[PDB]
A paper describes a structure:
Guidance receptors of the Uncoordinated-5 family (Unc5A–D) have emerged as key players in navigating cells and axons (Hong et al., 1999; Leung-Hagesteijn et al., 1992), where they trigger cell-cell repulsion in response to extracellular ligands such as fibronectin leucine-rich repeat transmembrane proteins (FLRT1-3) (Seiradake et al., 2014; Yamagishi et al., 2011) and netrins (Hong et al., 1999). In agreement with previous findings (Verschueren et al., 2020), we show that Unc5 receptors directly and functionally interact with the morphogen receptor glypican-3 (GPC3).
Human and murine GPC3 sequences are 94% identical and the two structures are similar (Cα root-mean-square deviation, RMSDCα = 0.54 Å for 353 aligned atoms). Crystal structures of the core domain of human GPC1 (Awad et al., 2015; Svensson et al., 2012) and the fly ortholog Dally-like-protein (DLP) (Kim et al., 2011; McGough et al., 2020) revealed an α-helical architecture comprising an N-terminal lobe (N lobe) with 6 conserved disulfide bonds, a central M lobe, and a C-terminal lobe (C lobe) that contains a furin-like convertase cleavage site (RXXR) (de Cat et al., 2003). We modeled glycans on two predicted N-glycosylation sites (N124 and N241 in hGPC3, N123 and N240 in mGPC3) into evident electron density.
Author numbering: 59 to 185, 191 to 307, 314 to 348, 382 to 433, 455 to 476
């Protein structure tokens, strides 16, 4: 008589307060169903994100170790200072891989800025306050040739693809975790309450809602959610485009650095006088992608999941149509944030490869 959701066709066994209860369980039932649909995909990316993050850090640590080892072996006169700017470089390497605001060109530079004064003082002119004059002379006189720019492009290409690979996995975690927190319209909350519970208010014990009625209701409130599909697909294929490395580059840096130190030593005669006057991975991300491609239908199949895991009369016979038991059935802001972040990422993937 005073109900606001359950259309009272005949009498009704539930009051207004019982309509609250049914509306809140409708909310809770929807969130649980969405969360059950997204659990297995969420855990897949969470697993891989944790593994790949440690695997990359193992690579960076191994690359730092070997660069320090070739400094110990080939340039003992540059140690222990060598250990300081090598460690600072690879620390910034990791920090950049994990998404922090680090400038790759500033990394490579600062490395050669710190490396040149000790090369001059210990290898070229044996025999502290003039240090800043030497650091400026490194770049102003281009003592290292194209070696810094060579390393610059060599590592910026591989560190950018590794950084975006991690950023893409985490953002995938972020949007899939956002699905089961998706708040819906007030009209849908009433429709879901009608579809799932308002039959109990009419005194029915085993009646299930119609599969067709569930389809028009689900398509009702997932109209915005389903629009994410196109962008979620493009995210999957763009991620496949990137995987199809950074180890070989980072584990080759010593070689390039060592040759750069030979290069600056080749013109020492004129340089000293001028300055004196002046002063199994790839298998893992392949398996991840093949497992991620099984979830390309996630957003399109989502209304199908909610109806197929809720009790419905698929036959559309002897079912509940939201207001009565029939013989046959007749028949943005958060979502836009998901699409924006998907758009931003997809663009970022497509440009790398
Ligand atoms: C290798 O790296 C680990 C951790 O960075 C360090 O404890 C160890 O001393 C390194 N070994 C060599 C030979 O550089
Ligand atoms: C999922 O979302 C909830 C609430 O927004 C948040 O507390 C939680 O940390 C998120 N989990 C992940 C793995 O992002």
């Amino acid at each position: 008589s005073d109900l606001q959701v359950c259309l009272p066709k005949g009498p009704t066994c539930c009051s207004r307060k019982m309509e609250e209860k049914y509306q809140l369980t409708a909310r809770l039932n929807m969130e649980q169903l969405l969360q059950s649909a997204s659990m297995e995909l969420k855990f897949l990316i969470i697993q891989n994100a944790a593994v790949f993050q440690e695997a990359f850090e193992i690579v960076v640590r191994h690359a730092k170790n070997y660069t320090n080892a070739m400094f110990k072996n080939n340039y003992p006169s540059l140690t222990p200072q060598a250990f300081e700017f090598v460690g600072e470089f690879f620390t910034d390497v990791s920090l950049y891989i994990l998404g922090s605001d680090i400038n790759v060109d500033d990394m490579v530079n600062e490395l050669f800025d710190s490396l040149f004064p000790v090369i001059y003082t210990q290898m070229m002119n044996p025999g502290l306050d003039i240090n800043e004059c030497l650091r400026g002379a490194r770049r102003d006189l281009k003592v290292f040739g194209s070696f810094p720019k060579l390393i610059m492009t060599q590592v910026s290409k591989s560190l950018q693809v590794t950084r975006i690979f991690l950023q893409a996995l985490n953002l995938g975690i972020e949007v899939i975790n956002t699905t089961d927190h998706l708040k819906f319209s007030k009209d849908c909350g009433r429709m879901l309450t009608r579809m799932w519970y308002c039959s109990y208010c009419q005194g029915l014990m085993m009646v299930k809602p119609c599969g067709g009625y569930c389809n028009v209701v689900m398509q009702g409130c997932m109209a915005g959610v389903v629009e994410i599909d196109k962008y979620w697909r493009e995210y999957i294929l763009s991620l496949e485009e990137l995987v199809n490395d950074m180890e070989n580059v980072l584990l080759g840096l010593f070689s390039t650095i060592h040759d750069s130190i030979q290069y600056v030593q080749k013109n020492g005669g004129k340089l000293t006088t001028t300055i004196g006057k002046l002063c199994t991975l790839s298998s893992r991300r392949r398996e991840l992608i093949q497992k991620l491609k099984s979830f390309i239908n996630f957003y399109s199949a989502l209304p199908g999941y909610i109806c197929s895991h809720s009790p419905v009369a698929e036959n559309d016979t002897l079912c509940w149509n939201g207001q009565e038991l029939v013989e046959r059935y007749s028949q943005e802001p958060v979502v836009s944030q998901i699409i924006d972040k998907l758009k931003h990422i997809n663009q970022l993937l497509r440009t790398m490869s």
